[PDB]
């Protein structure tokens, strides 16, 4: 059984140098951004505003086709700009400075990995992002700014060519993955460090990922719970660290003695 300062003495002695990182939405709770499932908060509990079929219909394109205005009304509250990353974020960030990240996984599209300072070549924006989007029509590609104001002043985006409904490039429900998710296939097998923060590894392949690291290869949890493949299919080098993201995340910095190196960082970027 390994530790959280058995991980912690790996990365000291760069034992473990080529981190890939799985991020979800929860690493951005503590951010102000909500997740999807957490009672109370989760996305999925408090959309009774917008009287839809279920809940996940707002992330999903039928309901988008049939009406994009609870989506866009959602987006508005959503849209990138103010919310800053948390010590999460700089956490990864800074394993990026010391030459360990191999790369940086995410499922959300708040953008605060980048917003970090993590450059784009380190990141895997796997269900997309705001930075583009795309006419639903006739798949003219655009700025995602362009649409910004539209969002803002609560309307709907339309295509000056051809009138169709333009859509950030998010990714919907069964919508494609995107092509830098293709990535995965060279990343995983060189990880010699895997790191999952804040997700609770339901959607499919991105959960998988997990087990595509070689088995001698520690997978270190960091969630308020067990969660996926650490869950049923644990393996001998796992790690967890139960608990609030940041706590988690504080504890791990302490044992590998960046508790000022992190302190300087956040100061400087904020
Ligand atoms: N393209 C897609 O697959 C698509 C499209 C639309 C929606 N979604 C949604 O994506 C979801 C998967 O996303 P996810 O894993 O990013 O989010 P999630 O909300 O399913 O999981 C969040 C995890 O973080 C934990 N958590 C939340 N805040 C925390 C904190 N401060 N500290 C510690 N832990 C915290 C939660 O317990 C949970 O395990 C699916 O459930 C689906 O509804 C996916
Ligand atoms: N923090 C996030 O970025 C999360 C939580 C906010 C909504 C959201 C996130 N991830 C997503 C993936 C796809 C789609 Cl359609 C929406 C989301
Ligand atoms: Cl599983
Ligand atoms: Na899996
Ligand atoms: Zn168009």
């Not at 362009?146 to 803002?152: E, F, L, Y």
């Not at 993201?245 to 302490?254: D, P, T």
Request: glycine fraction near 6%; charged fraction near 20%; include cysteine.
């Amino acid at each position: 059984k390994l530790s959280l300062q058995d991980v912690a003495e790996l990365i000291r002695a760069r034992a473990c140098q080529r981190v890939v990182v799985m991020v979800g939405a929860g690493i951005s709770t503590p951010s102000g951004i909500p997740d999807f499932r957490s009672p109370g908060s989760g996305l999925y509990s408090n959309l009774q505003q917008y009287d839809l079929p279920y809940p996940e219909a707002i992330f999903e394109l039928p309901f988008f086709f049939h009406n994009p205005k609870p989506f866009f009304t959602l987006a508005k509250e959503l849209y990138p700009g103010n919310y800053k990353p948390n010590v999460t974020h700089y956490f990864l960030r800074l394993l990026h400075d010391k030459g360990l990240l191999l790369r940086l996984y995410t499922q959300n599209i708040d953008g605060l990995e980048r917003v970090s300072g993590i450059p784009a070549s380190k990141l895997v924006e796997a269900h997309g992002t705001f930075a583009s989007a795309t006419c639903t029509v006739c798949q003219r590609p655009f700025p995602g700014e362009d649409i910004r104001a539209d969002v803002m002043a609560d309307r709907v985006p339309r295509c000056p060519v051809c009138t169709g409904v333009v859509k950030p490039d998010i990714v919907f429900f069964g919508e494609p993955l995107p092509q830098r998710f293709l990535l995965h296939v060279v990343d995983f097998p060189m990880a010699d460090l895997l790191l999952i923060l804040g997700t609770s590894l339901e959607v499919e392949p991105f959960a998988s990922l997990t087990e595509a690291v070689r088995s001698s290869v520690p997978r270190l949890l960091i969630n308020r719970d067990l969660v996926g493949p650490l869950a049923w299919h644990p393996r001998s080098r796992d790690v967890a660290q139960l608990g609030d993201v940041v706590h988690g995340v504080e504890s791990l910095v302490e044992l590998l003695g960046w508790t000022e190196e992190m302190r300087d960082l956040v100061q400087r970027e904020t």
